[PDB]
Amino acid sequence: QMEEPAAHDTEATATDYHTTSHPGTHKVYVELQELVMDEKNQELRWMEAARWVQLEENLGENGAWGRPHLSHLTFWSLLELRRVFTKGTVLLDLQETSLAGVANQLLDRFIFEDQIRPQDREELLRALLLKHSHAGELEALGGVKPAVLTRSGD
Amino acid sequence: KWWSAVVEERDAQSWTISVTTPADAVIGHYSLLLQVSGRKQLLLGQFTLLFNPWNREDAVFLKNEAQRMEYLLNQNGLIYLGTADCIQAESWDFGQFEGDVIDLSLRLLSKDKQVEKWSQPVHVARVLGALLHFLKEQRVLPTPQTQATQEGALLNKRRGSVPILRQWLTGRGRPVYDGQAWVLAAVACTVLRCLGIPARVVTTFASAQGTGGRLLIDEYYNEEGLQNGEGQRGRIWIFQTSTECWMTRPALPQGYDGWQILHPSAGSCDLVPVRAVKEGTLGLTPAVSDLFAAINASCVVWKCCEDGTLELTDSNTKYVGNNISTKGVGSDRCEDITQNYKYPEGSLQEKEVLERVEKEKMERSPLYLLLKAPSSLPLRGDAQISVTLVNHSEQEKAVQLAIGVQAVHYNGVLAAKLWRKKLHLTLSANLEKIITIGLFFSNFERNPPENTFLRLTAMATHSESNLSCFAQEDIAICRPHLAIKMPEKAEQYQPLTASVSLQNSLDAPMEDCVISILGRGLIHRERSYRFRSVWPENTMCAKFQFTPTHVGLQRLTVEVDCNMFQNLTNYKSVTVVAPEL
Amino acid sequence: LPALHIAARNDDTRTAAVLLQNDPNPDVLSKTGFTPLHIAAHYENLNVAQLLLNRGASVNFTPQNGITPLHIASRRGNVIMVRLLLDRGAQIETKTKDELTPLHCAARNGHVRISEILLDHGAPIQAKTKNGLSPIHMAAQGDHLDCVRLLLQYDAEIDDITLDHLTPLHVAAHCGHHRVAKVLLDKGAKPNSRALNGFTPLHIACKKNHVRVMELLLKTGASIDAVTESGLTPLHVASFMGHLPIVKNLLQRGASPNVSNVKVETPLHMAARAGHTEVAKYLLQNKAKVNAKAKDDQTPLHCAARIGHTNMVKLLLENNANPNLATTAGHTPLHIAARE
């Protein structure tokens, strides 16, 4: 057999990626999307839930945005963010123009760092390339329900 | 021809304006301002202006297109090292098309304070060469004298040019030691390839770097066959890198456009056209005489003795400055441009030019041997060499033969004493005699350094007559071959599995196998993997999986380190095509 | 129409566009007779080249010279024009007035990438121009090393001859290139190969005074002894041309001054026919019998008398060649000295 080896990290060449480019200051606008599935056909898709121009502004099931309000978060969320960010994977200064390349490099770094198993790469790659709708199409969909992916793809 | 702007297409809320540029303008960060008769002047944005080899009327103009893509648009180059008998290329990535490199180059330019003479490439090239030579003499640290093999994997690994540029400007990375001082030319070539000036990097084997103005070189040798003392003002280096740029010279007399060599001097730099170097016109530029003397000058060798009296010795003539080569266009192979630098030796024309330069400068063995040695010797291996001896005298003769082997740096610096052997022979009856002797690494006295080349010298002293014969040869060390298995064409956004195979030719088991893969447009930064021990009989074959992302022509490189050696590199190219619609 | 070619030279698209909108002529001849396509292939201006190739531009449109535009494109070296003209259709196997294929001029100029493309597109490696010269001969002339390497890697019969039987090693030694001699040596060659005259490559090295080729040929093991069809030796050629360091090395490395041709002549007899002084002193220093007889038993004084040059005589009398000696016909050095 052709033996698959183990990775190893040594950051002597980390110094060899530090640009000196002062980037500049910019405002941000945050948009959150998650996997769901519409009712007419059992097909998963990403749907947005809220935006963060100034304050958290959520999107209802009827498709209308509500009032801005202060941002309150939950404690279990902060625990899991600290745990997964302490041992997370970072990719800085990617040189891309399309999402597929970002996905492929993310998968290569996942396999490289033993984050996910190689046999799951195809299903998640199929997931990350579905169509991304917007606020105008929701009334065309007739309602959506949250869905979770499976190994068989059903 | 002059600055102009037309508003070609008009919309009720929009104009489309076509700005035009002059052929001779200063480069740098510009800013556009709009001033109507009423309002204050308004800033519209910023841009930068560079040279174009595509315009016919500009001074710096190249006719061929593929030469442009090779000398200006390419990023993945090769640099050839080793002896002229076996030359090994090493893959390099200039990375001239990063974001901050152009601004760095302009920041280097702005210490000149002569703005308008920035419109011409001659002055910019000369100033940038001078400043970069000063910066290399500033920020280059000498090598650590102590032996550190465990960190020798880190001292002499190179990743490219931009880290070296960053550490030279700021000093916030690894320094570049005296073992590899030849990068400077490549750095300058990178800067010109950033700026718009076409350029390439040539390598001259067996160059006489040192003092110039004289066409004679002295060398001192031991009684035993070594070099007493270390160093010299003018010595023959093993190789030397240089930079060529393509432009036209209006300030010179007519008939000298084209390639020029960039030569810094110990500060004022200058550039010289290659036809000027070949023809030999000394009074055309103060630097032509020394560089042309650096190519075709002859050496004499002296024999030191116990008394201190130096003796001339009869040796075979060796050549200087041969087999200059560079990277070919549209491929990954070497090409020699030496016919553009010298006439064929032994022509009427070369004798004429030699007589002319000598006329300009005038105003200012009863026995012998010869040596046959292989061009390459394997590491942890052995070889055979042969020395023949022919005498011309009716009487018999006694002779003492000495043989010396020692390592030497790439700039004539002595590195290590390795082996010596002395024996007595008696030649008779005017008959030739051949002596074949092996060379095993186990018989040596020391382990060679990381980057060195062995110099084998032979000295035959006649017992009766003090006139002695001498010969020398240089041998580079070759490493085992690294097989790369990969299909030729690949589709974008598709998985691709490459294979790398290595056979343990060495007589020792390998430990701490650490390899690393990288490539631009294939992997984001770098990777690394570890392995088990490899015994001297078995091999190791491995496979990696990636996916190409950027369409076109790429190449990837792998680099292996272990306990016997470090920084063993190899590369392989690939052409990736767009996916089918 | 004398300016349509100028528009091709400057790639003026709109002017030529109007000129072909009005006129229906896609090809006209200049005073030389070259079409606008020839200069479009020359200056690599491809917008007008595409415009011309869109209508009527015959790829096989040969003048009386027979120089195809493909020939010029291979001459100056433009790759993309070769690819475009081959995509639109091209007859590779054509002849000029001199029966030159594009591969011939490609091998002569040194453009290796166009040659690789051409051999990829089915160009025949073996060919014969008006003389019969192979492309490797011309590529060995212009000192193109890696192009020769490419033809050797793809396909080459090394020991090929032409109308004057010339291996590429022979033209390499006639043109003074030691690098192609090295590659042709280590890949494959025979030093014994002789031309129609019977000359060794050592003879060519002795003629054209190239030294590195001589050292490499003798390091290979080319024999010192060799017989021309006339009857001479390479030492005799070096003596007849007057090259001192070549004589020094060849006589150092093992040679015999005592050698006879089909007319019994030493290199001293054949050298004093021209009077090269330093080679004569160098041969005289080593063991050579100055008392000697030529074909008609002329002493070296007899051949030296016809020159009238003085110190060659004093060097020959230094080894006391007697003026008592005379030829078969009875003539003496005094007789020939009074004759001349």
From Swiss-Prot, chain A:
Detected in erythrocytes (at protein level). N-glycosylated. It comes from the Eukaryota. Residues 147-154 are annotated as: Interaction with ANK1. Changing P118S: In SPH4; Mondego. Changing E11K: Found in patients with hemolytic anemia; uncertain significance; Montefiore. The modification Phosphotyrosine is found at Y17. Changing G101R: In SPH4; Fukoka. Coiled coil: none annotated. It is found in: Cell membrane; Basolateral cell membrane. Changing K27E: In Di(a)/Memphis-II antigen. Belongs to the anion exchanger (TC 2.A.31) family. Functions both as a transporter that mediates electroneutral anion exchange across the cell membrane and as a structural protein. Component of the ankyrin-1 complex of the erythrocyte membrane; required for normal flexibility and stability of the erythrocyte membrane and for normal erythrocyte shape via the interactions of its cytoplasmic domain with cytoskeletal proteins, glycolytic enzymes, and hemoglobin. Functions as a transporter that mediates the 1:1 exchange of inorganic anions across the erythrocyte membrane. A dimer in solution, but in its membrane environment, it exists primarily as a mixture of dimers and tetramers and spans the membrane asymmetrically. Component of the ankyrin-1 complex in the erythrocyte, composed of ANK1, RHCE, RHAG, SLC4A1, EPB42, GYPA, GYPB and AQP1. Interacts with STOM; this interaction positively regulates SLC4A1 activity. Interacts with GYPA; a GYPA monomer is bound at each end of the SLC4A1 dimer forming a heterotetramer. Three SLC4A1 dimers (Band 3-I, Band 3-II and Band 3-III) participates in the ankyrin-1 complex. This is Band 3 anion transport protein. It comes from Homo sapiens (Human).
UniProtKB/Swiss-Prot annotation, chain B:
It is found in: Cell membrane; Cytoplasm, Cytoskeleton. GO terms for molecular function: ATP binding; protein-glutamine gamma-glutamyltransferase activity; structural constituent of cytoskeleton. The keyword Mitochondrion does not apply. InterPro entries: Ig-like_fold (IPR013783), Ig_E-set (IPR014756), Papain-like_cys_pep_sf (IPR038765), Transglutaminase (IPR050779), Transglutaminase-like (IPR002931), Transglutaminase-like_sf (IPR036985), Transglutaminase_animal (IPR023608), Transglutaminase_AS (IPR013808). It is a lipid-anchor. It comes from the Eukaryota. GO terms for biological process: cell morphogenesis; erythrocyte maturation; hemoglobin metabolic process; multicellular organismal-level iron ion homeostasis; regulation of cell shape; spleen development. GO terms for cellular component: ankyrin-1 complex; cortical cytoskeleton; cytoskeleton; plasma membrane. SMART domains: TGc. This is Protein 4.2. The gene is EPB42.
From Swiss-Prot, chain C:
ANK repeats lie at residues 1-28, 32-61, 65-94, 98-127, 131-160, 164-193, 197-226, 230-259, 263-292, 296-325. The modification Phosphoserine is found at S256. The modification (3S)-3-hydroxyasparagine is found at N60, N258, N291. Component of the ankyrin-1 complex in the erythrocyte, composed of ANK1, RHCE, RHAG, SLC4A1, EPB42, GYPA, GYPB and AQP1. Interacts with a number of integral membrane proteins and cytoskeletal proteins. Interacts (via N-terminus) with SPTB/spectrin (beta chain). Also interacts with TTN/titin. Isoform Mu17 interacts with OBSCN isoform 3/obscurin. Interacts with HIF1AN. Interacts (via ANK 1-5 repeats) with RHCE; this interaction mediates the primary membrane attachment site for ANK1. Interacts (via ANK 1-2 repeats) with AQP1 (via the N-terminal). Interacts (via ANK 1-13 repeats) with EPB42. It is linked to Spherocytosis 1: A form of spherocytosis, a hematologic disorder leading to chronic hemolytic anemia and characterized by numerous abnormally shaped erythrocytes which are generally spheroidal. SPH1 is characterized by severe hemolytic anemia. Inheritance can be autosomal dominant or autosomal recessive. Patients with homozygous mutations have a more severe disorder. It comes from the Eukaryota. The chain holds residues 174 to 513 of 1881 of the full protein. This is Ankyrin-1. Isoform Mu17, isoform Mu18, isoform Mu19 and isoform Mu20 are expressed in skeletal muscle. Isoform Br21 is expressed in brain. It comes from Homo sapiens. The 55 kDa regulatory domain is involved in regulating binding of SPTB/spectrin (beta chain) and SLC4A1/erythrocyte membrane protein band 3. Regulated by phosphorylation. Palmitoylated.
